[PDB]
Design a protein around this nucleic acid. Sequence first.
RNA 1: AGAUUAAGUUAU
RNA 2: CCUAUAACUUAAUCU
Lengths: 106, 114, 906, 69
Amino acid sequence: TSAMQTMLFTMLRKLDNDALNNIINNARDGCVPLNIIPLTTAAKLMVVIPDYNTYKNTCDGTTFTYASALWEIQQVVDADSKIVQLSEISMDNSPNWPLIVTALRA
Amino acid sequence: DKRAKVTSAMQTMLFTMLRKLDNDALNNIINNARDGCVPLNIIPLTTAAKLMVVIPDYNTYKNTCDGTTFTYASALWEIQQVVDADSKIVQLSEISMDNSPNLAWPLIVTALRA
Amino acid sequence: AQSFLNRVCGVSAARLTPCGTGTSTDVVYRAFDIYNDKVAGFAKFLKTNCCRFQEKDEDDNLIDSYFVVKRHTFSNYQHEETIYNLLKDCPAVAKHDFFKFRIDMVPHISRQRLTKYTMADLVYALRHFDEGNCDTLKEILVTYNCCDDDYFNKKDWYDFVENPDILRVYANLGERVRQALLKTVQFCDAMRNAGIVGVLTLDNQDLNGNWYDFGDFIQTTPGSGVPVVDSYYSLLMPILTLTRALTAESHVDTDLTKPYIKWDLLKYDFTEERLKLFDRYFKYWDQTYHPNCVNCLDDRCILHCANFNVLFSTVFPPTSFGPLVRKIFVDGVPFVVSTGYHFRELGVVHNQDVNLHSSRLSFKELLVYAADPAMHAASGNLLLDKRTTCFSVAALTNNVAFQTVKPGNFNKDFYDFAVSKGFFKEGSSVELKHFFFAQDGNAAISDYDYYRYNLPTMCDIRQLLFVVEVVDKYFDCYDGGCINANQVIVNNLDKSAGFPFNKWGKARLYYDSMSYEDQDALFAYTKRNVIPTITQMNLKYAISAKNRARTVAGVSICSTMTNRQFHQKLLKSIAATRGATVVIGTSKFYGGWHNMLKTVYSDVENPHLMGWDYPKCDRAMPNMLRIMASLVLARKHTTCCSLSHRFYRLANECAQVLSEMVMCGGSLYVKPGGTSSGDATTAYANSVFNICQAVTANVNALLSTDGNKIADKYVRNLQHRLYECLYRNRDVDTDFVNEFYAYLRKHFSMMILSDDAVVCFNSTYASQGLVASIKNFKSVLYYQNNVFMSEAKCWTETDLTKGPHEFCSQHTMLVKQGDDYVYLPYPDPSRILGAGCFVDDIVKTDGTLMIERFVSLAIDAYPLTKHPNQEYADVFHLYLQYIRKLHDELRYWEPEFYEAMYTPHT
Amino acid sequence: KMSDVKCTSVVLLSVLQQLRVESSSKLWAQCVQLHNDILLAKDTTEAFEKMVSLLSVLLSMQGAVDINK
RNA sequence: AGAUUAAGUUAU
RNA sequence: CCUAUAACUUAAUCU
Ligand SMILES: *P(=O)(O)OC[C@@H](CO)CCn1cnc2c(=O)nc(N)[nH]c21
Ligand SMILES: [Mg+2]
Ligand SMILES: [Mg+2]
Ligand SMILES: [Mg+2]
Ligand SMILES: [Mg+2]
Ligand SMILES: [Zn+2]
Ligand SMILES: [Zn+2]
């Protein structure tokens, strides 16, 4: 049960692939993905951001880096369907947190 | 020894299939026959009160069970309930071409004989 | 020149253009069904005695109509005119014009408005099919509006599996074939009323249906003419179900524009309709036709009549076939049991032992009521399943079950050990290609949907009767017959007992619960009654190289018990015989592979090796060939069973493993045909089917070759006698069956194991066309097996130093063993490494059971050490080092033990 | 190499199957599809993209804590 | 050397 | 839920 789960991550960490490591690190910090990552030309991806400091390291503008790929942000809701502009993000309005980002890749 | 258990289990199962059996529309086809002998493939086709339709996609649904009532096997069948592959109750408001990617196909509709 | 062209026009005043130049004849390459004392067979020849003229349209465009002017002699001219004047009123006769023209005054016979190709060209194009050499078939398809000319730009257009639209394209020819049948019956009536005796051949009727050759016709007293139509109908019989020629008989008034006939739902007999169809389309076929095969005289008569029934059962509705049920009272409480069966092949069969009133149920009659599907379907719901195109009888439960297949369990310690030993490098010869593929919940019904490849197939019945005699010679050395219940040997009693018997116990419970007298009473009951049974489909969890799901068929305990008691003596006698053609039961160990190969290379003179593939073999096998295979096995019951007993055993096998009710996921379906994988006789019936298709390919090779260019006079006389024994002679000629069998054993040496085959054949005879090749197998599988066999799945080995390329998925190497050279079987190393890396239980990756598992895999992996490839040889040393590592982490580890498994001393 | 990701796909799909992911047939169908197409992949760049798409099914539900690992 | 039971492996 | 047949290996009893 759990030995299968330990033998997964001991051989996942030996493939040494940046995309697998990028999503396992993001998952470790709580930046998990709600749906399945698509690998087609363009489709939708929903990424949950727990709080601010793990958002600036991924998002700088209209493009965020995920699984060694670039995904352009379309919508940010926060524990509602409370749409939030992209100009909002700064530490200056940090109390202004389970947050969803629904984007599309190139 | 163990012969008694399996013969009682065979006898018990074979009898409760007669409690399930329709017994009055069955007699109307079993006595309209020339020799009292009918094919088996027409027994659930003309007597069974419940019909199950397994539908793979949306085109098959609109061609087969569009509306609350549909006609199959020269009879009239009114849908009772629809479930998906995960056996969750689907309403008829959900089965549209817009919401067709969100459903767990196939859908198994169940229709009583009207 | 122009004057001759004007004379050909005549009263028609048709605009003609010449296909030849001047007055000289035009040479065409057509297919003729010829029987002389010079030559025989159904081959392609040169027709050199005809001048052809094409008739232009109103806008000066070429149409299908042709004017055929034939010049032979004066005596044939006067004789054909005398026959035509008797036959001119018939509308099935093409209009003839007799004249003389001065080219020196040679006489001419002008036939008016014929098509380009005859019926024999169509029959030969469909019965000798070749991809890239199907120009005649393409021209026929685009001429009679079956498809456009750009249909052949789609690749795999001819393939029945890759493109099922070719069935519709071929069905566009069926109305022309049906019109040719009606015109043949009209021509035979006109020959009988006018007193004319002659043979009808397929090359004398065009694709319009008109008859035009009378050179071999002789006159007799009127009212008593006899037409001979055996070669005609027999060579035409596969086309009747390929083109679906009797499709118009389903409609009202036989009119394709009119709607369908709404038959009665309670109607099942269709005996008089079968007789009306036989009198309408095959009136002058001389052999008696029984619509119900219970009235047949022997097993050859069963084959002959079941062949007409597959054709005539495509007209009737599919709800009439299957079990025939009748209400009976048990202690006054009523049942619904099966008192008969309506077969597509055998007609109506009624049970002889049935009581309407029973006052107690024994274990045996409870068993036949539980096994019977009539009770199960009369209680369940109606089911309309749209995932599959197969017939759906009933849904037994209110749910639909969705069985998935789990992935394999990874064996990490062996993979880490193998990576540490240098395996799985980049660019290496050995890589993992065998895995456990998981399946989603729609896998079970998607594998069941592959019974759409099974089509109703009518056979060439004369050819099939000769082939079943030759096939019978192969099984001659074996002993068979019925045995008692105490002589039955069961390999594994703790296996499934099928449905609905798996709710109460395994097979051990039913073998312990019935006495020997009850088992013998049940076996005697199946000799006078038909017990319909339900077959369970189960997804099988096993390693593979392809992502296709694999289902196994679970047969009921009643069927497999009576079938063991009927067949096991012959099956044990086949399994315990060495040196024969069927090599079921022969081990590859202890020199047995070398003995099998030495036996296959017996007396071939210019030896080459050949193996082939059956695409979708379990699915697409025709019902006539399965019945033929069943009859061959039942030819050992000549002294223990009467003909009625043998018919009822055949009817029980057809109702149990051929067209039974199949329970796939809590719902009942109708199996169209094919072989159940869980019957006792499956591998052996597959062996009979393989030998039958090989003998059919050799017959079609020897008859389609030009008899004038066969250099050996023995082979030419053999081809003449082959045509005589197929089409002219009705009774079995056992001396020619022996002679053709000895010819086959001399020049076509086989090794058969359950649709896997290796043939050592004479190469010079195959290049001359005297024995079969891959092309003949492709043609036979096209017109008979309804599949396309690509030549990439086949192999050919010209150097017999190297062995067969693959047999039972094992390759072959020549190995210095001791003082001599032997043949050793080695497997693909990906399969061996995948068996060690992936297991189906989490209990097979420790130090408990994995030692004896790895030993068995090292036994199967030993002969890779003689391979020239180094990684191939290192597979065995890896398994050996790992058996050591398991042996010290708690005589086999030493390499000598493995060598002893392949040396000839047992 | 390619064999490492072909074995890791097998381990991951058995991990997902232990977490009762076949309770939803829609998710199990594309999990089975991704696993079967990793096991039939020839180029290793094609196998890696599917591995990301399949591992995100595990990183979607909160049933296996990666914090512990 | 033979038979019986249990388990396993391969082939079809 | 887990088929049929064949071969082989291992273990244990009786001979
Ligand atoms: P082979 O695998 O190429 O054989 C073809 C085959 C049809 O599936 C028929 C052989 N056959 C019949 N019954 C079988 C069974 O239960 N298991 C296997 N592997 N092969 C069977
Ligand atoms: Mg002719
Ligand atoms: Mg002639
Ligand atoms: Mg096959
Ligand atoms: Mg093979
Ligand atoms: Zn007959
Ligand atoms: Zn017998």
